[PDB]
Design a protein around this nucleic acid. Structure first.
Lengths: 55, 100, 144, 19, 191, 56, 67, 142, 141, 77
RNA sequence: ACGAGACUCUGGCAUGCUAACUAGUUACGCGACCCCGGUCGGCGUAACUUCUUAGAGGGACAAGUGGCGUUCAGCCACCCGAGAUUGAGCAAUAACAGGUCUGUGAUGCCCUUAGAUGUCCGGGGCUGCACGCGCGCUACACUGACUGGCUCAGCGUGUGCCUACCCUACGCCGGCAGGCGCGGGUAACCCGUUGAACCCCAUUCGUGAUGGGGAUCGGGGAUUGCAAUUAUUC
């Protein structure tokens, strides 16, 4: 029963069920506004999205 | 028909240009039109750190993105609305037409 | 009224423990282990004792009545959840437990845990924090 | 449609698509 | 159309200041009199704008101290009103006259400042500014009331009241007069 | 009205060094840096490492 | 404090050197002249320029200026 | 037929207080309740400052209904006590010869300038690295 | 003619509590003596018949604003919860207490179930509140 | 320099009651704090004594508050 | 030439302009109640921007007056004035053996690669305590604790992609933590006029480690999850 032994653990919540959509890292995610990116990749790609520093 | 046109974008000057174009078109087409309703602006803020590691003085970033919305009312049938909205649209302005 | 009554009790002997009558009745009987400020307001609400009278000028009939209510309150319309020792581990009966009984019940619970050799009983036997918390930087009174 | 995500989420998804 | 203006129920006229050095620094004379000791503010924005502030406002602002009382102003106002009731009810005269005379008696005339290098307790004798004398008297009276009404059955409004009455005559029993005499003797000691 | 090219990384040696080449006009502060200059940061996969490019 | 910079003083010097019959002592009139005849991309710079023109002409109707 | 009215507002921090003056019997009620029953009761004199400073004869032929929202308590009290005086000044200016406006405005200015002009003060924005706008977190050495 | 807005609210609540005590048709539940009014409270109320006072306060709040149900009415009797060592937080009151108060006032002819999730006042209840306000105003004057 | 632990009395004695009703209404200022100081009585007892003296009509009141009560004597004029 | 300044965002004001049934105000009519007027965020409809929303403009420049100054750059004080020093963003040449190879399908060299230093599953640990230190929370009380009543906000978030898990008024049950059918909201529309606390009023308490403080500890009951023992949380 290797096939059903491979997924005896359901990962439907927690930190391991969510990953960054760029670098596949599971630390420091941004779940605000459905971004689902880490902080470093969000800062790297924040100019083209529209987030600009005013205040 | 009580048809409504919603006008939203990121920048404000292209939205104001296309809104003034729609108002002046409805004025030159000899038809009553209500003024643009200025919705309150939605502000999207994420405050994140600057250092990728955990070293240095604790400095934060303040990213911000404002979104504007307008409301446009007409008193015309559908083909008038399509022929006034299918000509000279801004590239950065998102438009949605709703009828009741 | 404001003048002292004749035969005023200064020290009251309730369950072989010294209780002063100089304080309010709702806060003088709380010196008994096992009863508290919330429970003192309930034992004095079912029986007719006014809460504005001191504990030294109360009458003996009222004293014996509040003794009976504080021993056996289940048949005088006191809820089961309001009691402290409910669903007992041996017989399964609801009973509010008084001072020396509270000490004895605590001693039997600790001796039961030590006999059954559970983690909590072992930590009680060692002298550690049994609820489970970071005792690395706190609790410096454990040794000298 | 039956999803109709919010006005903030639509702009965020448009920026993600552009990136 | 009021002929005169009463601080709640107290007449602001027929009061004088004996010391001519504090004529303009105590503002209780028919120009700065109000009804309540709670103004809109803007008195510490400039460099000498606080001299126009009334002394009841100054005492109300200076009374709230020690962390747990910061910002509580209406409570201090009702403490001051109950106090002024006790001063009028005990001595019999106006509370504003006792308050003004308490500034004169409990204000230091000269103080010793630090001189020399670091570490030395070498002091030089100077004299105080008249406005700084008012501030020192206000601070001393408020901290005297504070240390009187702490862990005691006496209340705060009574402890403020007995501090002002004792300071109005200088009976060497209030804490502020004792501290003022100690400052005068320690500044006269190394002159 | 100006340009600035800087090349960063290891260049004919083990210790890294940066060579900045600038001439003309170049502003850095304020809002007018945002809508005047264009800055691109790319990489070069050399045989001894990675090289940095920053032009504006 | 309030010390003017190179751009305000230089712009004021050249607008008085090139124009005198249109500019005067009133701040609002030469402010509007500096709006019309000069290309100023802001408003604080415009106001500082017009104020320095007013001060410079208050100097000129008194005595000569070497600049 | 013709009716005369004026709507004058006032504020301290964020609490606006829009007043309303027109012809009628002398009555002043804010949010339905009179001035003598406005909590807190400590500041009843501060609320009653313009009426008791100008006299009852000035408020003999005008009715006043003020709506106030926002702010806290003291800011609302200051907003109403500014709004009453501003509304009376504007009403006399609009419908009376303004010698009366001058003879109330000079003594209103002579008492406190707060009664007519606003208070240009707001809360400063918090910055990162401290619990407030100016204070900072404690810096540890060694 | 005087309404409740032109008379002091504390004396109105006390007199209305006395009036609903004197009426004797409120159907006080059995667990009123042994109950805690909110999870942030510590002791029982010192008043022995506080249900009449709570009913009077609920009636006054319903006169001031309508469309208040149970969980909306629960937010009025809130306060800080002293968490011991942890910092305090705002907490709501009890739900069954407000349910029993509004059910008792619906059983009495004072409260009418307002349409679309609310409880307005019966016009008889509004009239009764105006009599209580007028009596308090006449007693004070 | 002695601490002198305050053994205040909760209910009255036969000497405390008549010394109070002889002397305390002749005070210039009567406060629960000062009569607890000069009578060595409990704080709630002082509030009860001033309430019953106010009910008897022998003591004038000037102000009422939840944290402050001030009591005087009647006017001798 | 760069840096500063200059520039941008925000706050403070305009009873003037352009506009609002997803924001209101004022009038009129229909209602409820009190003694002819007062109250109502109860209902409906003829004007407008006074409140609200947000676009273009305007205002403040040491502009005016009196002194000091080489009468140049400037400084001090005052009147009229909403402002006569609001706050932040951006930020130069030269470097540091500063931190990050554990953010990266950024990466050179070295190591390992089936009895693995890749991978997945189950159990445990990162929480273990004679001690030392740093950032913090709660208090040492009567300007206070408890118990009722009264009354006041602004920034924000909200049904998701592989992605299950949103915010909740209302009616019932139970002290409470909570529980099924029941409606709205892709949002100035519903939560929500966000009935926030501190404060305000009135009892109880009275210098007592006390009704301050709530650490430690025993018993019971709920929700999340496949699973709570080393108590998840209440």
């Amino acid at each position: 029963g290797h096939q059903q032994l491979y997924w005896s653990h359901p990962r439907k919540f927690g930190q391991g069920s969510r990953s960054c959509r760029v670098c596949s890292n599971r630390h420091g995610l941004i779940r605000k506004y459905g971004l689902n990116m880490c902080r470093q990749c969000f800062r790297q790609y924040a100019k083209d999205i529209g987030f600009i520093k005013l205040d | 028909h009580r048809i409504r046109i919603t006008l939203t974008s990121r920048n404000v000057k292209s939205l104001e240009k296309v809104c003034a174009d729609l108002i002046r078109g409805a004025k030159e087409k000899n038809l009553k039109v209500k003024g643009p309703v200025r919705m309150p602006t939605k502000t999207l803020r994420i405050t994140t750190r600057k250092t990728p590691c955990g070293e240095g003085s604790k400095t934060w970033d303040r990213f911000q993105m404002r979104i504007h919305k307008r409301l446009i009312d007409l008193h015309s049938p559908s083909e008038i609305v399509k022929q006034i909205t299918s000509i000279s649209i801004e590239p950065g302005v998102e438009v949605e037409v709703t009828i009741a | 009224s404001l003048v002292i009554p004749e035969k005023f009790q200064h020290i009251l002997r309730v369950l072989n423990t010294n209780i002063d009558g100089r304080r309010k009745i709702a806060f003088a009987i709380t010196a008994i282990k096992g009863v508290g400020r919330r429970y003192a307001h309930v034992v004095l609400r079912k029986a007719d004792i006014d809460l504005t009278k001191r504990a030294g000028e109360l009458t003996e009939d009222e004293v014996e009545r509040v003794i009976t209510i504080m021993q056996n309150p289940r048949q005088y319309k006191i809820p089961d959840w309001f009691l402290n020792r409910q669903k007992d581990v041996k017989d399964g009966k609801y009973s509010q437990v008084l001072a020396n009984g509270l000490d004895n019940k605590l001693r039997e619970d600790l001796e039961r845990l030590k006999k059954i050799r559970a983690h909590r009983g072992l930590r009680h036997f060692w002298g550690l924090r049994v609820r489970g918390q970071h005792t690395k930087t706190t609790g410096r009174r454990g040794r000298t | 449609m039956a999803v109709q995500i919010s006005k903030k989420r639509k702009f965020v998804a448009d920026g993600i698509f552009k990136a | 159309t009021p002929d005169i203006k009463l601080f709640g129920k107290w007449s602001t006229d027929d009061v004088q200041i004996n010391d001519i050095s504090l004529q303009d620094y105590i503002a209780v004379k028919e120009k700065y009199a109000k009804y309540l000791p709670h103004s809109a503010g803007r008195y510490a924005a400039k460099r000498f704008r606080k001299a126009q502030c009334p002394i009841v406002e100054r005492l109300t602002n200076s009374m709230m101290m020690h962390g747990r009382n910061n910002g509580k102003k209406l409570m201090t106002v009702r403490i001051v009103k109950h106090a002024f009731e006790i001063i009028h009810l005990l001595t019999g005269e106006n509370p504003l006259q006792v308050l003004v005379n308490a500034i004169i008696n409990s204000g230091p005339r000269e103080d010793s400042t630090r001189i020399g290098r670091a570490g030395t307790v070498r002091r030089q004798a100077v004299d105080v500014s008249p406005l700084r004398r008012v501030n020192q008297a206000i601070w001393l009276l408020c901290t005297g009331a504070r240390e009187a009404a702490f862990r005691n059955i006496k209340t705060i409004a009574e402890c403020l009241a007995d501090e002002l009455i004792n300071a109005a005559k200088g009976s060497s029993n209030s804490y502020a007069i004792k501290k003022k005499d100690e400052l005068e003797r320690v500044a006269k000691s190394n002159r | 009205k100006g340009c600035e090219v800087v090349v960063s990384g290891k260049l004919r040696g083990q210790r890294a060094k940066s060579m900045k080449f600038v001439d003309g006009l170049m502003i850095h502060s304020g809002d007018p840096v945002n809508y005047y200059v264009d800055t691109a940061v790319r990489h070069v996969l050399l045989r001894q490492g990675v090289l940095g490019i920053k032009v504006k | 404090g309030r010390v003017r910079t190179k751009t305000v003083k230089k712009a004021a010097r050249v607008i008085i050197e090139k124009y005198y019959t249109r500019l005067g002592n009133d701040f609002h009139t030469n402010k509007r002249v500096c709006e019309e005849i000069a290309i100023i991309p802001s408003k604080k710079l415009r106001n500082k320029i017009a104020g320095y023109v007013t001060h410079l002409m208050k100097r000129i109707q008194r005595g000569p200026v070497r600049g | 037929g013709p009716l005369q009215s004026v709507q004058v507002f006032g504020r301290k921090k964020t609490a606006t207080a829009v007043a309303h003056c027109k012809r009628g019997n002398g009555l002043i009620k804010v949010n339905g309740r009179p001035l003598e029953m406005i909590e807190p009761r400590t500041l009843q004199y501060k609320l009653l400052e313009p009426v008791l400073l100008l006299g009852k004869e000035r408020f003999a032929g005008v009715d006043i209904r003020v709506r106030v929202k926002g702010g806290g308590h003291v800011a609302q009290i200051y907003a109403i006590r500014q709004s009453i005086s501003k509304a009376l000044v504007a009403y006399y200016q609009k419908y009376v010869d303004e010698a009366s406006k001058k003879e109330i405005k000079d003594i209103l200015i002579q008492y406190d300038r707060t009664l007519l002009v606003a208070d240009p003060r707001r809360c400063e924005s918090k910055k990162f690295g401290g619990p407030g706008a100016r204070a900072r977190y404690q810096k540890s050495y060694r | 003619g005087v309404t409740v807005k032109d008379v002091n609210q504390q004396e109105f609540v006390r007199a209305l509590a006395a009036f609903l005590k004197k009426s004797g048709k409120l159907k006080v539940p059995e667990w009123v003596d042994t109950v805690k009014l909110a999870k942030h409270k510590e002791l029982a109320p010192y008043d022995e018949n506080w249900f009449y006072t709570r009913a009077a306060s609920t009636a006054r709040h319903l006169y001031l604003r309508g469309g208040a149900g149970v969980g909306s009415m629960t937010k009025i009797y809130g306060g800080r919860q002293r968490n011991g060592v942890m910092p305090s937080h705002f907490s709501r009151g009890s739900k069954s207490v407000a349910r029993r108060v509004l059910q008792a006032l619906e059983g009495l002819k004072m409260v009418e179930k307002d349409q679309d999730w609310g409880r307005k006042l019966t016009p008889q209840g509004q009239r009764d509140l105006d009599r209580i306000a007028g009596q308090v105003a006449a007693a004070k004057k | 320099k002695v601490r002198d632990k305050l053994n205040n009395l909760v209910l009255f004695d036969k000497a405390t009651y008549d010394k109070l009703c002889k002397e305390v209404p002749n005070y210039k200022l009567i406060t629960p704090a000062v009569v607890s100081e000069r009578l060595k009585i409990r704080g709630s007892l002082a509030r009860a004594a001033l309430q019953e003296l106010l009910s008897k009509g022998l003591i004038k009141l000037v102000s009422k508050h939840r944290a402050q009560v001030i009591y005087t004597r009647n006017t001798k004029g």
